[PDB]
């Protein structure tokens, strides 16, 4: 009171000092059951991968993809990422994903990178210097390499120019290194641009077959529909908490409600555009939201010059949630709120310090 009045003495009366509100206890968040997972098992558990110059391309859109398990997979030799951090990509998401799968040599694993050159990097698959996404590489010597020679795999060795970003070259034209033309038959200056891979089970690290899949993320103006599930939690009732019901955020106390939502609404507002009811996305039931209690506090004093003790009134607050004056003295509940520090008397006198609803207080104690 003295601080609010900015004085060291207080006259008799009732003053309004500060406010009061209940604080949130914990937080909750709800989301639908989460289904329609992006097809990724058939990509990384596929039987065979195509050639490096004929890399398989897969388009991913309109699903939910959990990349945390891929990042936590212990069977992957190399898991690199360029555009974003591998840990936090599960939250942010773009509109579509492109997967390029192929098989290269052990020493050619670092050819597939921005700002890199090589036979694969310039003839089979070239990444733009501004590429965003990730690359997953793993040895497959026990599977792809053949004891009789895995010559089914083929790699491009010759081309007049390099490869454009995300461009596939499958041209089988006879490369003419020299100026002597050839009528489709390789000669001194004519050669086949594609050569079979000579993978063997016993060839050493660096020449063993390595399966590599490159994931690229694109953010066309169409709405983004592919990224990780949003983990939900349980719910509580009869507690002023803050909630995030399917992206609708607010603070209040949640109770059971008897309103009858029609089967396509999700939340309701009464008037002046204030939400009152929500539907939990999992259990599909109607809840009720109430703002948890608040109100002003006032001090009743007989005057600093007279005495030194005071009483406190919380305005429009039920006498159940009061919290140093948590117990104090006898506590009275009145139509105007709750009062602490004064005793109720059966007599009746002239009104000294008005309080409200037909009652007031005076000093004798208060």
């Amino acid at each position: 009171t003295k601080c609010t009045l900015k004085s060291f003495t207080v006259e008799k009366g009732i003053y309004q000092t500060s406010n009061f509100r209940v604080q949130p206890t914990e937080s909750i968040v709800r989301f639908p059951n989460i289904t329609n997972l992006c097809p990724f098992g058939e990509v990384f558990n596929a039987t065979r991968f195509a050639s490096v110059y004929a890399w398989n391309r897969k388009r991913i859109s309109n699903c939910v993809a959990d990349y945390s398990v891929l990042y936590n997979s212990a069977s992957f030799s190399t898991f690199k990422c360029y555009g974003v951090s591998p840990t936090k990509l599960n939250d942010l998401c773009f509109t579509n994903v492109y997967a390029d799968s192929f098989v290269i040599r052990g020493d050619e694993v670092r050819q597939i990178a921005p700002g890199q050159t090589g036979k694969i990097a310039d003839y089979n698959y070239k990444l733009p210097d501004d590429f965003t996404g990730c690359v997953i590489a793993w040895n497959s010597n026990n599977l792809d390499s053949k004891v009789g020679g895995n010559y089914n795999y083929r790699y491009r060795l010759f081309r007049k120019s390099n490869l454009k970003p995300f461009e596939r070259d499958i041209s089988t034209e006879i490369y003419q290194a020299g100026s002597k033309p050839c009528n489709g038959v390789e000669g001194f200056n004519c050669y086949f641009p594609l050569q079979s891979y000579g993978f063997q089970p016993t060839n050493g690290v660096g020449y063993q077959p390595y399966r590599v899949v490159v994931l690229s993320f694109e953010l066309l103006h169409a709405p983004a529909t592919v990224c990780g599930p949003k983990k939900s939690t349980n719910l509580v009732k009869n507690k002023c908490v803050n909630f995030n019901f399917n992206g609708l955020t607010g603070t209040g106390v949640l109770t059971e409600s008897n309103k009858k939502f029609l089967p396509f609404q999700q939340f309701g507002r009464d008037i002046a555009d204030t939400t009152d009811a929500v539907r939990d996305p999992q259990t599909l039931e109607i809840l009720d939201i109430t703002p948890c209690s608040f109100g002003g506090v006032s001090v009743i004093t007989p005057g600093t010059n007279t005495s030194n003790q005071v009483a406190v009134l919380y305005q429009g607050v039920n006498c159940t949630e009061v919290p140093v004056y948590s117990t104090g003295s006898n506590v009275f509940q009145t139509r105007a709120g709750c009062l602490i520090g004064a005793e109720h008397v059966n007599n009746s006198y002239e009104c000294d310090i008005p309080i409200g609803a037909g009652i007031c207080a005076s000093y004798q104690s208060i």
Binding site: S61, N62, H221, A222, P223, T225, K259, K260, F261, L262, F264, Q265, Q266, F267, G268, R269, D270, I271, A277
Partner: protein, 236 residues
């Protein structure tokens, strides 16, 4: 397997009155016993709606489609701008078991028709992006509203049992939302699909315009009455 027919399908393009049909729930918010004013695309009251007894038609901002259907002869819809494989096209079919939605660059024929003895009205189907299958859509009145806003296709539907003979009956019936699709296309024309067996159908088409309406919600949240704020001075 698509060929043009011999006779022309000279469907008479008649006109009739809209009355007070074509009201749909604008959002998914529940309100009880309240009057709410909203501005959006609607079919104006007492408008002048076209009646067909399969020409290429424009799309404009939105489309209101009505069918005085008997025994479920209408089957689907086609959406697009160039209607060829050089641009994206949308296809919706409702056969006996389910409804199929495709977003591909097809090569339709000059007079598509379903045929009965699946889909053969298109010569090619390439670069397919979106596929969808769901429950079937359909003396009955079938009302549909088609909208396309910021890459979202909105489809609202309603079915009504009627006993009147020819024109749209007087009354009020709101339309619930049915389907939302997050596909970005700039559709400007559309078409009707009929299962024409080799051996003459009436439907109504109207357009939507931006305006403000006043809607009444009863205790249960059902829209039971509406007022058009631009019809006449009393309504204003």
């Amino acid at each position: 397997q698509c060929v043009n027919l011999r006779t022309r399908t000279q469907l008479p393009p008649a006109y009739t009155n809209s009355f007070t049909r074509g009201v749909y729930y604008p959002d998914k918010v529940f309100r009880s016993s309240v009057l709410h004013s909203t501005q959006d695309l609607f079919l104006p009251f007492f408008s002048n709606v076209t009646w067909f007894h399969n020409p290429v038609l424009p799309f404009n901002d939105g489309v209101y489609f009505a069918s005085t259907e008997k025994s479920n002869i209408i089957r689907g819809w086609i959406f697009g701008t160039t209607l060829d494989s050089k641009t994206q096209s949308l296809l919706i079919v409702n056969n006996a078991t389910n409804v199929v939605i495709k977003v591909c660059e097809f090569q339709f024929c000059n007079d598509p028709f379903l045929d009965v003895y699946e889909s053969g009205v298109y010569s090619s189907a390439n670069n397919c992006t979106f596929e969808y299958v769901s429950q079937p859509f359909l003396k009955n009145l079938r009302e549909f509203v088609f909208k396309n806003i910021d890459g979202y296709f909105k489809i609202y539907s309603k079915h009504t049992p009627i006993n009147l003979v020819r024109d749209l009956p007087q009354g009020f019936s709101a339309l619930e939302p049915l389907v939302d699709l997050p596909i970005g296309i700039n559709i400007t024309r559309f078409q009707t699909l009929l299962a024409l067996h080799r051996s003459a159908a009436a439907y109504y088409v109207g357009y939507l315009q931006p305006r403000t309406f006043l809607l009444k919600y009863n205790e249960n949240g059902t829209i039971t009455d509406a007022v058009d704020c631009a019809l006449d001075p009393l309504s204003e």
